[PDB]
Design a protein around this ligand. Sequence first.
Ligand SMILES: [Zn+2]
Lengths: 307, 37
Amino acid sequence: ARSTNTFNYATYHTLDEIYDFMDLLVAQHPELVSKLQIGRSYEGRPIYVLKFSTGGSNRPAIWIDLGIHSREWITQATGVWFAKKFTENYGQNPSFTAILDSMDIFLEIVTNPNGFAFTHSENRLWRKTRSVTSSSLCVGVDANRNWDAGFGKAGASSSPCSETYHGKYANSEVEVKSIVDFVKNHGNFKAFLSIHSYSQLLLYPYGYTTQSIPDKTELNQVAKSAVAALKSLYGTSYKYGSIITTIYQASGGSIDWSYNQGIKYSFTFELRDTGRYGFLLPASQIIPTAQETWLGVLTIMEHTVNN
Amino acid sequence: XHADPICNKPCKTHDDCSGAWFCQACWNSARTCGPYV
Ligand SMILES: [Zn+2]
């Protein structure tokens, strides 16, 4: 509210409540966190990325994104808990401090800011951004069908009223171009994780094809390891494997792209539920979800530093 | 009538999911219409 110790992590908040928390966090830890604006949304809202650093060069960074899909609320809210938790574990947990002492972390909580505010005042089940343009009457692109990874091939729909609608070209979406340019400038991303909701799955490339990643073995095992660790806290059981293999063929997804860029540890997390609640996961389920899902992101990081 | 009749329907294509407004993806691991996550 007026303090990150007093901001309620076990409630669903709004854009304004979160662009705001991001401001408390930095003001609290200007030596650990910075707030970066990597772009401005479709409908003009700033896109913020939060960088967590103990200093150094152009240290190898870890990228974590939340909310590419607005309806999937537990990710923005897991998102807020990670920021809080980075700031507290540093210098506390040797593991966690080891990693900040070698790598920078890049945290993006509301990747799709337009669509999220849309879920609040209009439709709770909006999944796409709020881009107009098209032979359309029909707004928005599935931003996880817009990246340049088998773009516009099966797994993405060509009609604009579609839920899985891919945009007219790859990165057409500014929410999507920001990250890309950004990821691409830095050039020292050795990890890329994308958080989604719901179903309890830890996914690695590919989405748009059957061919299997060279690093298939590695990722399987880290995946293996990382699903193990999440299950340790509350016993939540996940499944893991390629996307094409365990949910559905999805051309143009985020992980697909980062992977082909050379971001080896590129994983997609599908958080809780399994469907009772699905997109409307009750609030009493955030701390839990965040704590387990951190044990899992943590695993992927130790791995990232180890090799 | 009350939301998505098709959700939880046994699937095999995305096509075998007539048209739920909600559950319109086949999940290749619970071969059931569910929504896109
Ligand atoms: Zn999603």
